């Protein structure tokens, strides 16, 4: 369809063996927790996934115990809410998608767990969308609950612009400029959509080193066992 | 199987042991000339279909864009 | 030439050298490879 195509940004993980910047993933998780978690869900990400990536065991335990999670039927036979555990997943904003429709003027905020993977050119798109709430031009008019984001399909995203400069304060203190926040949350969402990005690239580096060792050696063995024929000299000697 | 495959006569066939001969005799010495020899016997049969695929692909893209580009005369 | 006559000519020894080498190769490869990956990122 007719849509603005987000440009290519020089990400720190854009390279072939380039891993993710984990401080940026920590800052983007803070951005999600303070801003994006009010409407969007992360159903396939738990707190224990943050251990060894952005936070330690005790920091992630404190982060999990900051929230409340209904957990099981009491012996008395009823529900109850408990502080989150490292095994708890990220809390739902709404109990069901129809509540999300009712609370967001008919629009459904999608799962942001795989948003980067699910959106064509996601990392860019995300950054662009979050930073692309430009004014609608003449000739186009949008109804309430809509915003002209060139990048968003149709340029009418129900989501209002969620990142105002200094929307939240980074604990690290890095200036919380809108951009610094959009880049951090794009790195984090990326991490979310692929927690193994780093581990894999290490496997790929070992694979390239092993193939660079093994391909000329197997080629040399093949050319040994095929030299015999490749030197064979045929001669026709009719008895004449 | 072997032994009953074919009937040849008076065709002597000499050969050498693998360990007795260089592994890559003149590999880049003649390999390059040969690879180049090869490419010039097949390039005229292979390449021009893919060249006109590239032209048709670009053309389609650009034509499509122009198609999408608003008609200035229209709406005025 | 000595090596061939010692660890590469008898197939049993050929296997021995292979297995033993592989046992250590992993240590070296992993170590070296990791160094590189870390340096890169």
């Amino acid at each position: 369809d007719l849509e603005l195509h987000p440009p290519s940004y020089p990400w720190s993980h854009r390279g072939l063996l380039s891993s993710l910047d984990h401080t940026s993933i920590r800052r983007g998780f803070q951005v999600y927790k303070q801003v994006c978690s009010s409407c969007h869900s992360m159903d396939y990400v738990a707190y224990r996934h943050l251990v060894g990536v952005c936070y330690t065991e005790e920091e992630a335990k404190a982060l999990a115990e900051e929230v409340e999670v209904q957990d099981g039927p009491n012996d008395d036979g009823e529900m109850f809410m408990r502080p989150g555990k490292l095994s708890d997943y990220f809390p739902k904003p709404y109990p069901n998608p129809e509540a999300a429709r009712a609370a967001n003027n008919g629009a459904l905020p999608p799962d942001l767990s795989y948003i980067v993977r699910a959106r064509h050119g996601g990392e860019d798109y995300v950054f662009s969308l979050l930073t692309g709430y430009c004014e609608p031009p003449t000739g186009v008019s949008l109804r309430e609950g809509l915003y002209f984001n060139p990048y968003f399909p149709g340029q009418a995203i129900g989501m209002a612009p969620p990142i105002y400069t200094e929307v939240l304060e980074y604990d690290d203190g890095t200036p919380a400029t809108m951009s610094q926040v959009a880049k951090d949350v794009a790195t984090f969402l990326r991490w979310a959509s692929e927690p193994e990005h780093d581990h894999r690239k290490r496997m790929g580096l070992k694979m390239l080193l092993m193939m660079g060792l093994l391909l000329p050696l197997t080629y040399a063995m093949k050319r040994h066992k095929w030299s015999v024929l490749k030197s064979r000299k045929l001669a026709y000697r009719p008895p004449k | 199987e072997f032994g009953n495959l074919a009937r040849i006569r008076h065709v002597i066939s000499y050969s050498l042991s693998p360990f007795e001969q260089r592994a890559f005799p003149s590999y880049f010495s003649k390999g390059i000339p040969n690879v180049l020899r090869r490419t010039r016997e097949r390039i005229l049969r292979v390449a021009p279909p893919f060249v006109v695929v590239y032209l048709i692909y670009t053309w389609g893209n650009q034509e499509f864009e122009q198609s999408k580009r608003k008609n200035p005369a229209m709406y005025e | 030439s000595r090596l061939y006559s010692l660890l590469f000519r008898r197939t049993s020894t050929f296997a021995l050298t292979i297995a033993v080498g592989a046992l250590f190769f992993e240590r070296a490869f992993d170590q070296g490879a990791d160094a590189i990956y870390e340096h890169i990122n």
Partner: peptide, 24 residues
């Protein structure tokens, strides 16, 4: 007969002596 010709030259193939065989 079988002696009219000699084995063709493999010099461009042959490497450049049991002494060496062990290494080879």
């Amino acid at each position: 007969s079988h002696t009219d010709v000699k084995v063709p030259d493999f010099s461009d193939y042959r490497r450049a002596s049991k002494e060496s065989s062990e290494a080879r």
